[PDB]
Structure formats: C-alpha cells, structure tokens
Design a protein around this ligand. Structure first.
Ligand SMILES: COP(=O)(O)[C@](C)(O)c1sc(CCOP(=O)(O)OP(=O)(O)O)c(C)[n+]1Cc1cnc(C)nc1N
Ligand SMILES: COP(=O)(O)[C@](C)(O)c1sc(CCOP(=O)(O)OP(=O)(O)O)c(C)[n+]1Cc1cnc(C)nc1N
Ligand SMILES: [Mg+2]
Ligand SMILES: [Mg+2]
Lengths: 801, 801
C-alpha cells in the first residue's frame, strides 16, 4: 500500500487536451437528462424504479472517456469493449439522447419496453440488440467476464485471426461489487497472461446500498493491497486539483499522515457536514494540518473535492494506463455517491439545476424538460467532433456477422453415422465429430476447444498434438486450458461465442467439462450468456447420475438438464448414440453459424461409458433434431407397450424390451428420446397456439405425432421430471417415469442403476404393472417379476436415501 | 514476494516434540493401507476410481497435524474444524482403520456404498453422517466455506453463545484448486475480520490434473503475493533440513538466486531425472552453486527434499500459525505429487513397500494386505497416546443436537393468521414472523438473520434497532451483513445451519436476498449444503417474473423453484398470503429444530407487492403444509372449472374466478397452491409405491385427493413447468398451465402480466377454451373473449420474445 494521495503527482500530469468549460456544459446536460429520465419514470407510480446517485458519482469518469478515450466499432475492429456498470445506464441513455441516437419518446419509455419503443433498465443485448453489448448488472460477472474478453482478444491476435491490438477492454466496477468472489477471484490471470489491453475502473465512493463498504477500514487500501500483490499496475485518483498546493506546502508530512489514518466512515461523515466541521475534526487534528488552512474560508475548505471528480486527474490516470504494458491496470477513482444532489443525496431538482448551472428556466423546472443542443451550437459541434475522432458512437451492437462460412455437411460426419465396430462412448463420438470440423477449411481455425484442467479424462490428448494448447504449447496453440476454473472457462467460452458480434469474427467454442459443474456452478453466467446472445456449444461430460458411478454425491449429475431447460435460448440434448451426437452437432453448427444465424446456444450431455453404437436408421435425422424417433417395434401377442429412453439408460430400456417380448410375450415400440426438453417446449407451444386460436385446426405436439396410445414407460439417468415434463403431450393414458431422483453415491454402475430404480428390471416391472391394471395380465405376474428380479419393493424412496 | 526459501529460518525453528522414527513407522502403514484400499477396489474392474498420488504428497503434512495439532470434538467445543481435501480420503480412511475406527470389510467396500457397509469416495456427511463433516471435493467451496465458518465461530464467542476460542479451522487446499474464483475471491474477509482462528494449508506440488498449475511461472510466488497483499500471514515451507547447511555455506547468494529464477516447469523436470541431471542442470548453472555440491554424491544430491515432506519444517509452520493473532495464516507447503511411487506417479507394489519400509513380507505382498498395529506394540501405543492428548479422534460427527428447544406454537403467530388491516406483502409477513420468533425465550438468540447488502429493499431496518448488526452495530449485534457477496452470505448461512451438529449448538439462520441470485448464482453451495445436512431457511425475496417489474432480464426470477426442486432435501414453497407464510415457517421450525430433527432446509419465495391479506380459513393448516387447499367454491350454472394459483398470481386467478362467474355463469373451485413441488414429490412417491406393490390398492396423490375431475387451469409467476410438473397427478382430463417462460424485461406489473400471458384475462380465456372443447360453451364465445380482453393471439411466444 502507498500513501493515501494521487499516484500521479502534478509534475508528471499531462496537459488536459480538451475544452474543460465546454465539456462541463455538455456534462451538466447529460447529468440533467439522466435525472429527468428517472424522475419522469417515477412520477408514473408504476414501481418502475431507477438510479441517480451512482451515475452522479461517476459521470465525470465516463465523460473524460467519451471525450478522449473510447474507440467505437470501426472498419478495422470492434473498438473498445466497455463493460458499463449496470445501474448507471440512465447516464448512458442521456448521452445517447444528446448524440441524437435516441428520441425523447424513448427516454419517456425508460423501463417500459413491452410495447416496443422503450429502454431496458440495464445493459441487456437480448432486449436492445443494436445498443447494449455486455450484461453487467449481476454484480461480479462483469469483472471476470472482462478479464477473459481481454485474454480472448490477445488470443485472436496471436492466432493470426484478427489484429485486435488497438482495442482496450474497460470494466467499470463499483467498490461494493468487489466483495463478490468473482470480482477479485481471477485477477491473478490478468498478470499470468500480461493483459495490458485490460483496464479495471473501480468507482470508489466508499459506499454500497445499505451503507459503507468497510466503515472501519479503507476500501481503497484494501483494493490497492490485493491488486498490487496480484501484480497489477494500480493508479489511485484520490484528490482534486485544489489539494495540490496544500500537499505541496506541507513539509511536516502531517496532512499525509492524517489522510492515511482517517478511516472510510469518518470521510463519509465529513461530506455530510460543512466547511467549519472539516476545519475542526479533520484539519484540526494537528497543529500543522490546522495551519495549512488557517488562511482559508470555511467555504474554500468545503470546495476541496475528491479526485474522481476532476477531469485533469482522471485524464492523467487513463493516459498512464494506456502507456502501461506487460500487465493490467486498475484505476481506483475516489468519488462522492450522490454528488451535487446534496440533501436528496418538487423543488430539490431546483438544487441540481443550480449546482450544475443547468439552462432550465425556473418556471419550466416543473415540466421536468429534457435539454438538447441544437445543430450549429458550440456544444453540439464539440460533442460529435470528439466522438468522430474516436470512430463514432458507443455502445452499439451488430446482431449478425457478415461473412459466409462453408460449413461441413452431414455427410462429412459420415463415419459417425455407421455402426462402430468397437464399443465407444458419446464423448469419444464428440471428439471424433470435432476432428471432422477440424478438417473443414472454412471453420477449422475458428473452432475454440475449451477445457477446465480435465482433458485426459475426456481423451482430448489427441487433439493436443494436433492443434496444440494456447500459451503465449505456444501462442499459436488452439485449445484454451483454463485450469480448475469453470467460471473462467465459461467466460472464455462466452467471449468466443459472441465474437461473431463484437468483432464480426465468428468463432465456434466447444467447452467440455464435468456436467455437475456446469449450470449448477456457473448458472448466473449461463443466464447472462443467453442475454448476450452467445452461439456456441457447452458439452457436459461424465454426465448421468449412475454413469459416473464411483464419484458419488458431488459429481453424479442427474439434474443439469433441469437447470438448462430454464434458459430460453439454450437447446439441450441427451443423446445415447454416436450418430445422434453427429447429427445434433451438425445441426447446431448450421443453425448458429449457417445462413440462419439463430441466437441460441447448445448444451449436449456426453458419457464416459463405452457400449455398442449401431448405425443411424435411414431417415432418422429430422427425428433426432426434433427430439424423438422410433428405433423399432418388437412383436408380442400378450400385450403392447411403449418404451422411451435417453442417454446411457436407453440401452437398458432396449434390454427391457427384449425381456418383455421373450419372457412375457409383450411387444413394444421403443423410442430414443434425444431431447425431452425440446419436445416439452414444442408441446407447450402447440397448446398455447391452440388456446389462442379456438376456431382453428389444433396443432399436434411433435411427440404425439411419434407415439401412440399404448401404455408407456420412460427411463433416463436424470431425475423423473426430465421425462415427466412431456406428460401433457403424451397421447397415452398411462405414462410411467423412472428417474434418478436423490443424492448420488459411490458404487458400480449395476448397483447404482438398481438403487436408483432405473435399470431394465424396473422398466419391465413398470411395464407389466400398466398391463396388469388394464386387466391384460395377472397382477401376480408383476409380483413374481419383482421377486425374480430381486427388487426390494420396500426400500426407502431413493430421493430420501 | 520473498526469496524462494523457508519463511522460518532454522535458527528460529522450535525443537520437534515427537518421535520422528516411530511416527515414520506409523505413517508408512497409513500410506500402504491407503494404497491397498484403492488397488483392491481397482482389481474389481468396476470403474470405481480413487486417487493415490495426491495423498502421497501430503501425508506427512496431515501426519504432523494428527500427532500434534488436531483437537477432536470434546465436552467444551467441537474441536478443530478440518476441511480435508476431498480426494485424499483414502489416507483418512487408512488412518481411521489403523486407529481401529473402521473395519477391513469397510475398507474393502471403498466406493461401494449401496449395500450399507461401505465408504464414500469423498467427504459426504449425508452418506456417512457419523464420520465426515465438510463436503470439499467440489473445488473452491472448501476455502470460502472455511473462511465463513471461522467467522461464525468468532460470532458465537462474541454473542456469548459458546466459547469457541480453542477451535482452529483448517482448510486443506490444492494449488490447482486456488484457480477457482471462490478460492481467493473472499480472502480479504479473513483480514477485515481478523480471523486468527483460520489456517489455509495449500499443497503446492505444482501440479493439477493435466499438467503443472503454471509451468512458466511460480505458483508459490503468485500465491504469496496475493495473500500477503490481502493481509495474511504467509509461511512458505519450501525446503527440507538437508538444505540448511547448504544455504548457510553459500555466501555468494547464488543458490537463492538460482532458486528464485527457476520456474515451476523445470523443478518438475528435475524430479524426473536424477542426481546427475540436477547437479548439472540446476547446481550446474553457476560455478558457485556447483561448487557447493562439489563434494556431494549424485545420490546425496538426489536426497534433497521439498519442505512439505520434512516434519521438522511442517511443525514450525503450524506452530507459528497457532501462535499468530490478528490475522489468518496461509501455509504454502512445497511437495512432490506421487511422492515415492516411482515407476507410475507386483513390481510397483514391491517398490513402494521397499521405499517406505512397510512391514509386509515378500510372501504376503501379492495378497495386497492391510497393515495393523497390535495392542501393546510401540506403534499402537503412540498412535493412540497422541490422539488421547488431543481429545480423541477426527473426523467424526454428531448427527443430532442434544438440548430440547421450546419452540413457538402456531398460536404465537396468531396475528398473522387473521385478516390484515393494511395491505402488505409476503416479505412483510416474513419479517413479522421473525419478530414472533425474536420474542421466544428459547430461540431468540439462536436466530441468525443474514443479508447481502439488501436490507433496505426488504424493509428490515426495524430489525436493526431491535437486535443490531454484528460488527466486532457492535460485536453483540445479531444480524450478519455480508455485503454484495451471495456466496459469502450463503457460507455464513451454512455454518449457522450446521452449528447444531458441529458445535452441538442449534442456530436458526434466515438468509434473505434477491431470489434470482440464489440457486442460480450459488447453486453448487446449495447442493453441498444438502450434503452437509443444513437445517435453515433460504428466503428468496423480490421473487416472481412479473412482480419485480422494473428490474428486467437479470433480476426477474421465474425459475428459482425449478432449480430448488433439484435438491432432494430442500423443501420449497411459493405462498400467496401472510397466513401461509406463518404456517410454513412454523412447520419448518418444528420439523428441523423440534424433536423430529428432520435433515431438510427450507426455501420460501416472498414478494415485494402489497395486496389484501385475508384470514386463514379454519382448518387449512395441514393443506398449506402439504402444498394445496381449496380456498373457495363459486357457483355458476353454465359450467364448472378448477383454478389454481400461487404467489402473486393467485390474486389474479381469483379475479378470473369472479369474471368467469359474473360474465359467463361459469362456476369454479379455487385452490391456493403453496407448493407445486411438494405435491409433485408426493405424486411421484405414490406412483412409485403403486408400481412396487401391484397387489395393493393404489395410493392416491394428495393433490388428487383435494382436486376433482372438472377442467383445470393453473397460473403462476414461474415458467409453466413449475405447475406442469403435477400433470400426471391432476385427476382432470384438461389441465392448462400458464407461466412466465422467457426472459424478463422492464415494464409495469400490469404490462408484464399481460405479456407473459398469466393475468386474469388469460386464465379466463384458458378456462373458456376447455369448456368449449367439451361442448359446454360455443367456440365463438372464446374468440369474442380474446377480443374483449385485447389479447393478441399472434404475438410471439414469450419464451422467444
Ligand atoms: C435492483 O436494484 P439494486 O438492488 O439497486 C441493484 C442495481 O441490483 C444493485 S446496486 C448494488 C450496490 C452497488 O454498490 P457498488 O458500490 O458496487 O456500486 P455504486 O456504489 O452504486 O457505484 C447492489 C448490491 N445491487 C443488488 C445486487 C445484488 N447482487 C447482485 C449479484 N447483483 C445486484 N445487482
Ligand atoms: C473425478 O475425479 P477428479 O477429476 O480427479 C477430482 C477429484 O474431481 C478432481 S481432482 C482435480 C485436480 C486438483 O488438483 P490440485 O492441485 O488442486 O490438488 P492435488 O494436486 O491433487 O493435490 C480436479 C480438477 N478434479 C475435478 C474437479 C473439477 N472441478 C471442480 C469444481 N471440482 C473438481 N473436483
Ligand atoms: Mg460504491
Ligand atoms: Mg496440485
């Protein structure tokens, strides 16, 4: 930690390049319009909400950036990638309005978007696809997302894919936000990868929502301490220009001592008081500090401001960051939350227009009028002129990429569509599919395989020697090894999955990891990715409750599909066979990066269990995409049932089919369900449409176009809800579901599938029971089956075990 | 960052108090048994798994702790709280076997737990309730969990609840694991809270799973830098005793330089070569370092060891840690992964037998025998003697607390059971229920309210005046304010929710936060909390997609209930009324902390919207707990339907009930569903039982007991699946579900409820549609209603909007 003063002394401060007086005029107009936007919204009494105090504290920081640093998207690259602090959006909207990018009607529709001419509360690309770029309001995601975005830009340059050297990634963070583990938890990576294209700007107003971040301490010193120890360049912007002569003439060193020892709580106490109070409780602490202001009026003492409010100090910081290489820079900007709002922290708006010399008539204040600058005026010309020198306006977003990719056809995956002679797994199939893609001239180098330490577990060692590991193992390596860091790997995946938009450079990431540590562990990031319109593949390996058999309770995933189905634009599949993996990957590729450019991302669970992989049934492709298709029907004269399975359990459902036919003369229709979730969504969509068009021909759910009315049984390696979700749409009166509800445990696959009541034996007993209720077979046949299969009808429900 | 040598120079290293040679003999037996356990499992060829290399690198570190530091649970306190690294469990079992706490057959059932006499792969309290205590195999959860556990212990002492001062919290971490954002993301908290009762022990073997943590850098220096910067006491245990005369004899300083400059990757390379290579490639870098080992044999060179393998060095670190006050300590122990396993990490078994002088003859080696120490033997006496001086054995766990609490009766919540004068919300009801509890003498001081910088939004400032904020606002304060840190708050809640076991002191935490940032953001901790048998309340405030109307995409929660239902022992409710919240909190209090001592935790979503709160109907208590009860029956002679609602949307389904009756003569049965999930679980249990008892009379799901066969419509503020999950159990032919699928956005509650198609007009249209489909009414009247209600039948499905 260093003294509690500016890192950059006046002698090293560069001359400010802009017109300070003009800038303030424009800035006061942006401040005013931001407050008018939120106040007008409140007057509606619709509980819309909105913030003002935060932007008031950081307005000048953003202003210096818009006038002198921020590069907009241009012909060469995506420009500077700015992660705006989420709740200061009114200020962003106010500047956009001033630049003529938004209308007054839009501002009057702040937080009222349903009808189409409004503005979102926060940065949400999904809601305003041509404006916002990075979703940051869920605190903590912005910092880590920015770290991996900066690292990805360097990756694109090192790989010879795009010269991103002129782009800088700015992450505007709150100080309270720095307590989120995700906020400082990965800062060490910025130093390992020398991210000198990354700048963290922390708004240190010393406050969060309920109170001071650390009243009894000094948050700025805490931040400096850990960032410095993590190897970052730290620049503190503590005090305004009025303090220079004071610090300059104090030869005793007491003013610094005093600044150092005063804690955050007392500093916040001063800003609530007045000049006389500061003379007494701060400077009055020591004779030498009291002597520095003896000649000052209380009004002059009260004028002393924090550094983050002085354009000259701010500029110095951003310019120095720009020059700093070999590591990332964090700017700790000292500010006042609620700055210039005074009291308010209908005549208090009067106070604001007085404080910022806002050009609003006093008999007009009542109408809460927006201020604009006419074309031809000093302000309008200056506003636009600075932006043009910086390539235009931001934030802005391009919804689609421009180039045309020559994607592999399904036949290019032809090997995976045939019967495999050796027993392999769906993960092995996934890797083989990747290799096919790695042979396509159009996308081979746009692929971005990502792993979190674990590569040997998924047998990815082969691609290693083939395409290498990224290590600026050299800077041309293609695979991103993020170590034991699922969140970091997910942010790398997100940066890659949205490159088509931010850089107009489509990249196709495949992040493979232990499924349990997917949505369950990084779900907030997965929701954010949906908002950011990510297009890529998330591969949940070692999936299924009973399949990763020895690992137990914290590894056995029997519910990730329940978590993924909550994300509207995530398309989830649980394939049992290699040919299904091939058809699903090809389709996703085509939907996301083909001419359609669909804004969806994929989640495919894969397995670590080897078994026989049959050839793809002729004509089964569309059924695989849609979610279900019939494998075969087995004959039998004593009854008929429908058996559905997915993932690793399908082969056991087929085994049940052979038993039912040969031991009981019960025939059946056997279906491979590649996506219960897509089938459920389709069914929900059909019934919604039907409800809304009562006079028209009812739409039939896709699952009902494949299944018939015979009693059905479904079994999967996930909790019952995964298959039970399509109940409404199944055209049979009987639909029994087996699943892996309950905490996992260590044992052999055979023992877990029996414990979780999902194996062939339970499918047979479940099927026989449906026939027995129909009076087709004797109930004792079901009872004798339970006995012969060694089923404990009275053991505790696995969910409670 | 300091030089690459031990922090504690030999001149300051205390005398080691144990018998090194006897300890080595015991440790050798433990290493062998750990290895035999895993190899024996391996021979089964059931893909059971298990690790050996990691424990081999850390065994001595744990050995010194078991012999000289680890306090076991005792009469005064719960002993030291040890977060054992998950995958070194085989060594913990090996030792427990040796202390005679586990049997040979149990070791033979390593990773086979279904039949009841086996051992879990990793620390899982749920699976071994009397043995393991803290779930650590999900990397990164252990370190942050340990930080807040240490903090909770200080809270208990300060509140005057228990003298926990002799307890130390040890977190055994891997160096690869430190990359998880959760691993270092909260370390500044240990400094702010002066947690001198916390010790982080990082095993720096420089390797993770697929390679070195950072081969081109120095992970130990990286960790020292950030931890020192965060304010911790850092102790590096780098080199063994054989290096001392050497560092002393060098006066050029060339060794220290050489040690500082060599990078992780090369050190790993030396541990593969041999004395010859190291003397030329390490000492052979400068003539002065070569000179120091000039008179050494290559074999003497090869015997140089890393500090984490030397008991004398390990002891000094732990002793220094134990004495330190004012801050937490982190011990960076330098070790060799796969230590002594040569060949890999009967020829291999022969080698480790020889390497560690294991008392196993050549004749017995192929039997892969377990070693034991007979009573009376030197080894048996010392193993037990050291543990007795340290109060017993660990790990061990007490599943239930001993004291009897005198819980408040439902009658004590009587005010909340009556109709309310003022319009209030379920969140206000929750706060009042807490106030009832705060009056109960038996539990008032055991309550632990937890907030994450959102107290103001939840209107909890009334509680502050009452019980205060813990800030050691004084260290007697009862409320834990964790700031903007959901993971941290969740970890505090976990420590408190598990105090009943750990400290035999029941504490009842209530963590309230924005529901969106619950399971979605800290889901992995929530699953681990289930493993740890947490008993507490998670309150998801500002919940429902349409109810937190102005916040938008990343705040509007229409799916946390879909995430929470994946946890077997989490009981979730979405109440509409103040009386339902009181009945629910009373039942949860009683189930978890009453005589039953049920191992479950509660999740209740509450609202920020005020509306009329009526009186609880006479006798509805049991239905409220079960998940559903009939609120009212409205007459109508043109038709009859059943309407179900929960949360904030129930109010709306009741308005639709009124409209249907007044405008269409359609009668209805209206039900409040306080828990679709408990109803779904009950339906599944009934169906599972029915399947398993074919000869018995079928059991009826509770929801089917409550409902009838009249066409049904359900609407909630959550995605459709939340209500669809009970389809199988609803005894009516038609069951239409309305829900908030899709991404949230900003607008008025009215506009959002129309957009998500869950408001009264949609419930009415859904209901008329079922009647028309049956013939009760004309299809033209459903068409006229769609128009009358200004419903756009062709707007995009909200899921896609
Ligand atoms: C709904 O509006 P809100 O509560 O005002 C809002 C915008 O949602 C915020 S703002 C906020 C405080 C931010 O304090 P900081 O010091 O970081 O920022 P600032 O002082 O305002 O510059 C918190 C905790 N949350 C809540 C919050 C909590 N946790 C997460 C993960 N994200 C949040 N965003
Ligand atoms: C199936 O067994 P496994 O993969 O060997 C296991 C035990 O599951 C482990 S162990 C492991 C490597 C840990 O390396 P460390 O350096 O931290 O520890 P060590 O070197 O072994 O002393 C990882 C990444 N994971 C996987 C892992 C990944 N991500 C999370 C969050 N938790 C994990 N536990
Ligand atoms: Mg702040
Ligand atoms: Mg390691």
């Amino acid at each position: 930690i260093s003294n509690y003063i500016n890192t950059i002394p006046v002698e090293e401060q560069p001359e400010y390049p802009g017109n300070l007086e003009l800038e303030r005029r424009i800035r006061s107009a942006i401040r005013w319009n931001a407050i008018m936007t939120v106040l007008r919204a409140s007057k509606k009494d619709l509980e819309l909400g909105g913030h003002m105090a935060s932007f008031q504290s950081s307005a000048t920081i953003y202003d210096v950036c818009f006038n002198h640093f921020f590069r907009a998207r241009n012909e060469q690259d995506g420009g500077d990638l700015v992660y705006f602090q989420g709740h200061i959006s009114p200020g962003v909207y106010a500047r956009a309005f001033l630049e003529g990018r938004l209308t007054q009607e839009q501002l009057d529709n702040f937080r009222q978007e349903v009808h189409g001419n409004g503005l979102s509360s926060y940065p949400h690309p999904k809601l305003m696809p041509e404006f916002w770029q990075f979703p940051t309001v869920s605190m903590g995601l912005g910092p880590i997302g920015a770290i991996y975005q900066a690292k990805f830009l360097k990756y694109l340059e090192h790989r010879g894919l795009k010269d991103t050297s002129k782009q800088t990634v700015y992450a505007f963070l709150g100080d309270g936000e720095m307590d989120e583990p995700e906020s400082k938890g990965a800062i060490t990576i910025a130093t390992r990868e020398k991210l000198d294209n990354l700048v963290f700007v922390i708004n240190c107003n010393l406050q969060r929502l309920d109170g001071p971040v650390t009243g009894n301490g000094k948050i700025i010193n805490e931040l400096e301490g850990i960032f410095e120890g993590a190897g970052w360049n730290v620049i503190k912007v503590m005090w305004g220009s009025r303090w220079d002569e004071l610090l300059r003439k104090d030869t005793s060193g007491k003013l610094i001592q005093l600044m150092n020892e005063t804690v955050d709580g007392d500093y916040q106490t001063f800003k609530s008081k007045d000049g006389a109070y500061v003379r007494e409780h701060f400077f009055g602490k020591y004779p030498e500090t009291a002597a520095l202001v003896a000649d000052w009026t209380d009004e002059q003492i009260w004028a002393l401001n924090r550094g983050g409010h002085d354009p000259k100090k701010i500029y110095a910081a951003f310019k120095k960051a720009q020059e700093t290489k070999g590591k990332a820079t964090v700017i700790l900007a000292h500010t006042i939350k609620g700055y210039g709002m005074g009291d308010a922290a209908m005549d208090g708006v009067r106070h604001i227009r007085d404080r910022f010399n806002v050009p609003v008539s006093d008999a007009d204040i009542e109408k809460l009028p927006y201020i604009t600058f006419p074309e031809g005026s000093e302000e309008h010309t200056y506003l636009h002129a600075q932006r043009q020198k910086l390539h235009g306006y931001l934030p802005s977003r391009q919804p689609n990429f421009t180039e045309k990719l020559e994607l592999p056809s399904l036949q290019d995956f032809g090997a995976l569509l045939e019967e495999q002679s050796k027993e392999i797994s769906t993960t092995i199939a996934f890797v083989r599919a990747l290799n096919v893609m790695l042979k396509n001239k159009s996308i081979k180098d746009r692929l971005v395989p990502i792993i979190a330490d674990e590569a040997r577990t998924f047998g990815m060692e082969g691609l290693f020697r083939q395409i290498g590991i990224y290590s600026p193992e050299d800077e041309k390596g293609q695979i991103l090894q993020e170590g034991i860091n699922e969140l970091g790997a997910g942010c790398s995946w997100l940066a890659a999955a949205t490159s088509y938009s931010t850089n107009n450079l489509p990249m196709i990431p495949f992040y493979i990891y232990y499924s349990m540590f997917g949505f369950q562990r990084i779900g907030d990031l997965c929701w954010a990715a949906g908002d950011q319109q990510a297009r890529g593949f998330l591969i949940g390996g070692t999936s299924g409750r009973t399949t990763l058999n020895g690992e137990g309770l914290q590894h056995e995933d029997g519910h990730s599909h329940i978590q993924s189905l909550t994300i509207p634009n995530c398309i989830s599949y649980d394939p049992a066979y290699a040919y299904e993996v091939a058809v699903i990957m090809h389709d996703g590729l085509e939907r996301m990066y083909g001419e359609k450019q669909e804004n969806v991302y994929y989640y495919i669970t894969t397995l670590n269990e080897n078994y026989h992989m049959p050839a793809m049934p002729e004509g089964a492709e569309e059924g695989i995409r849609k979610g279900i298709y019939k494998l075969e029907t087995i004959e039998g004269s004593k009854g008929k049932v429908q058996l559905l399975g997915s993932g690793s359990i399908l082969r056991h459902v087929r085994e049940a089919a052979e038993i039912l036919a040969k031991d009981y003369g019960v025939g059946s229709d056997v279906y491979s369900v590649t996506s219960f979730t897509e089938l459920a969504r389709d069914g929900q969509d059909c019934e919604r449409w039907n409800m809304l068009h009562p006079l028209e021909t009812p739409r039939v759910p896709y699952i009902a176009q494949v299944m018939n009315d015979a009693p059905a049984v479904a079994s999967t390696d996930y909790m019952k809800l995964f298959a039970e979700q399509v109940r409404t749409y199944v055209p049979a009166d009987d639909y029994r579901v087996l699943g892996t509800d309950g905490f996992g445990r260590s044992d052999s696959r055979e023992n877990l599938r029996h414990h979780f009541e999902v194996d062939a034996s339970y499918v047979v007993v479940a099927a026989l029971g449906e026939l027995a209720k129909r009076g087709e077979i004797d109930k004792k046949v079901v009872a004798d089956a339970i006995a012969k299969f060694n089923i404990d009808a009275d053991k505790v429900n696995p969910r409670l075990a």
